Amino acid sequence: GTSHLVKCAEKEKTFCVNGGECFMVKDLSNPSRYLCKCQPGFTGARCTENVPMKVQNQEKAEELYQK
Fold first, then answer.
1. Given Cys at both, which of 3, 8, 52, 56 links 12, Cβ 3.0 to 4.6 Å?
2. List the disulfide bonds.
3. Alpha-carbon Rg of the chain, whole angstroms?
């Protein structure tokens, strides 16, 4: 309906490799569209690159990409 998602899981996260927040709905003329979110820790595409995300105290080349 307007909020009847179901999302996949650790046993159905195919489109999305790791974590992510996969999504498949039961609407439209062609439902069951699996998706693939990238939770704080993944990037690139299907969430296959564990972003080297990390913020340290003082430095100049290690924080979150330049700025």
1. 8
2. 8-22, 16-36, 38-47
3. 16
Residue with tokens 């340290």: 56
CB atoms within 10 A of CB 60: 6
Q: Kindly report the number of other CB atoms within 10 A of residue 6's CB atom.
A: 12
Which residues, 6+ apart, have CB-to-CB distance to 32 below 8 Å? 24, 25, 26
Spatial contact of 42 and 18, defined as CB atoms under 8 Å apart: yes
From the list 28, 24, 30, 31, the residue with the least C-alpha distance to 5 is 24
> What's 23-63 look like in SS3?
CCCCCCCCCCCCCCCCCCCCECCCCCECCCCCCCCCCCCCC
